[PDB]
Design a protein around this ligand. Structure first.
Ligand SMILES: [Mg+2]
Ligand SMILES: [Mg+2]
Ligand SMILES: [Mg+2]
Ligand SMILES: [Zn+2]
Lengths: 135, 94, 136, 134, 38
RNA sequence: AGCCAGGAUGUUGGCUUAGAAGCAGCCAUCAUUUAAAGAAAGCGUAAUAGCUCACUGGUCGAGUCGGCCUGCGCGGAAGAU
């Protein structure tokens, strides 16, 4: 078993996380100090966004059982992906602000409505309001 | 669980045993029960590996000779005085 | 050092050292220093190896000495001609045959036992090996 | 940028620091008094983790933290040592309410923690130090 | 350097090298660790 | 294996000391955030800044580690016409 068991498990955790995940916004994660990500990670905690990085191969095995065949093209090199498990949306805006104001990666891709969102069309999810608007 | 392939020895004695051990084999004896003891030969390295696991000396072992299988237990072992090698093994029929 | 408290006879024939050893298994401890070569083990060498092991483990665990020097070795005084009787006992040795377990250890990790036995083996005139207790 | 000048309640900390800050052309006396005026409300025996920032413009930029948790012994435990040999002795016990009070006190510094996880975190320090709860 | 019958690594930075049919120990850290079999 | 990035919070753990901040010494060695990160493996320092290791992700793309038995070799190996 050992670490192969652990990696079999690692896929398992991201698998059922993707079951409850609603909208996914994938970005990169290189060249930035770890302490700087404390702001985004704390934001994800409080805004109900779960972030995790598995290998291109573990990312390959871990999305076939979930409705996430749309974002299969953008899996090249390092793949940071965060998942909004509650209050769907409001994740592209959370990453746009940190991307354009820090001179680094803009965006990789996204995932919503069972279709892939290109890099230049993430503004719809960035401008998408909260779920509580019918009142 | 531990199955050992064996062949019936055709020649016995001091000289034959040394020739066997030079050929990377070693003799063993199967006795017990109402039938006559059977002298067989084992290939050294495979048995040397199985005997490293302690369960070998506790579980019922299976020895296959001429297709026929006999359930035995390791009754006694003769090791080389200073080399990590086996010289002889006693098997009692289970 | 080790030597018999008393003996039936003061002096002993030279004899020979043929054959393999008796006591080839680890009987008391869990690790043992088995002798591969053949020769004599003097009381001084046995004590020298014992100290090296004992300090290596810092007197933790238990140590068994499976050999005892019981054969007296005589030497004539310096610059003395042949004959005029057998020489005087000078020291005691233990005859060692291949396969003899010389030292045993318990209560220490295996790796610590290996270095402890390695340090003692450098004090002995006979090639040795490290052996472990075997079930049956 | 090195943590120094703690125990702001005591002015001119030259004897503890001395030639350590002599590399930087910082007025030891002048800046110590100024920091005292800003933060004289705290207890005299309370360290404040501050840095000494140097850049091209020589513009000081400092932000204030909370006193270290260990000097936080006379508040409820009423001890000054804890244990010469920690976990081998017992000098006092901390109430559940006390560490929670420190928990929201230090919530502005924990880089990553939740209110509950911070409370469980600071109780680990107390156990390893020698204090107990419940 | 140390010329002795038994040459061996004395630290993690020592390296066993055979240069002219002789065994040598070269150390990037401790020049005291330089040995040669002889 | 090499190369890139990170190696964090409590926290300068407690005691000691003029100071002892992972790194003189003694005791403890937990807890969080973590992808990882020791109350620190070595250098550092008056005490700390500072370097680097464990540890973790990335790149690379197929083998790679350390024992066991054994054949032949190597060093150990300096004398006098
Ligand atoms: Mg013959
Ligand atoms: Mg040359
Ligand atoms: Mg030779
Ligand atoms: Zn070296």
């Amino acid at each position: 078993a050992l670490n192969l068991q652990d990696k079999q498990a690692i896929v398992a955790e991201v698998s059922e996380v993707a079951k409850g995940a609603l909208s996914a916004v994938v970005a990169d994660s290189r060249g930035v100090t770890v302490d700087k990500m404390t702001e985004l990670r704390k934001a994800g905690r409080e805004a109900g966004v779960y972030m995790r990085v598995v290998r291109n191969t573990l990312l390959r095995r871990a999305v076939e059982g979930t409705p996430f065949e749309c974002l299969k093209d953008a899996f090249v090199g390092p793949t940071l992906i965060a998942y909004s498990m509650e209050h769907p949306g409001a994740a592209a805006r959370l990453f746009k602000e940190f991307a354009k104001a820090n001179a680094k990666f803009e965006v990789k891709a996204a995932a919503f409505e069972g279709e892939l969102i290109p890099a230049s069309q993430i503004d719809r999810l960035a401008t998408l309001p909260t779920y509580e608007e019918a009142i | 669980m531990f199955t050992i392939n064996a062949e019936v020895r055709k020649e016995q004695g001091k000289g034959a045993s040394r020739r066997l051990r030079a050929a990377n084999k070693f003799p063993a004896i199967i006795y017990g029960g109402k039938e006559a003891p059977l002298a067989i030969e084992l290939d050294h390295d495979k048995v040397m590996n199985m005997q490293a696991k302690a369960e070998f000396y506790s579980e019922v072992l299976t020895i296959v000779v001429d297709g026929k299988e006999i359930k035995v237990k390791a009754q006694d072992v003769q090791r080389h005085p200073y080399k990590p090698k086996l010289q002889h093994i006693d098997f009692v029929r289970a | 050092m080790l030597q018999p408290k008393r003996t039936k006879f003061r002096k002993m024939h030279k004899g020979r050292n043929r054959g393999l050893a008796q006591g080839t298994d680890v009987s008391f401890g869990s690790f043992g220093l088995k002798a591969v070569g053949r020769g004599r083990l003097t009381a001084r060498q046995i004590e020298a190896a014992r100290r090296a092991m004992t300090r290596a483990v810092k007197r933790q665990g238990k140590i068994w000495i499976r050999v005892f020097p019981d054969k007296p070795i005589t030497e004539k005084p310096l610059a003395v001609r042949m004959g005029k009787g057998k020489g005087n006992v000078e020291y005691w040795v233990a005859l060692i045959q291949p396969g003899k377990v010389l030292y045993e250890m318990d209560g220490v990790p295996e790796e610590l036992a290996r270095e402890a036995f390695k340090l003692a083996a450098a004090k002995l005139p006979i090639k040795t090996t490290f052996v472990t207790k075997t079930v049956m | 940028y090195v943590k120094l000048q703690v125990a702001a309640g005591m002015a001119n900390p030259s004897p503890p620091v001395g030639p350590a800050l002599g590399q930087q052309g910082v007025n030891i006396m002048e800046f110590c008094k100024a920091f005292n005026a800003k933060t004289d409300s705290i207890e005299k025996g309370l360290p404040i983790p501050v840095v000494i920032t140097v850049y091209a413009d020589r513009s000081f930029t400092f932000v204030t933290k909370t006193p270290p948790a260990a000097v936080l012994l006379k508040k409820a435990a009423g001890i000054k040592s804890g244990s010469g040999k920690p976990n081998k002795d017992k000098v006092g016990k901390i109430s559940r309410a006390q560490l929670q009070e420190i928990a929201q006190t230090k919530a502005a510094d924990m880089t990553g923690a939740d209110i509950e996880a911070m409370t469980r975190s600071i109780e680990g320090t107390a156990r390893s130090m020698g204090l107990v709860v419940e | 350097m140390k010329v002795r019958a038994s040459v061996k690594k004395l630290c993690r930075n020592c390296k066993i090298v055979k240069r002219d049919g002789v065994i040598r120990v070269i150390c990037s850290a401790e020049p005291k660790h330089k040995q040669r079999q002889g």
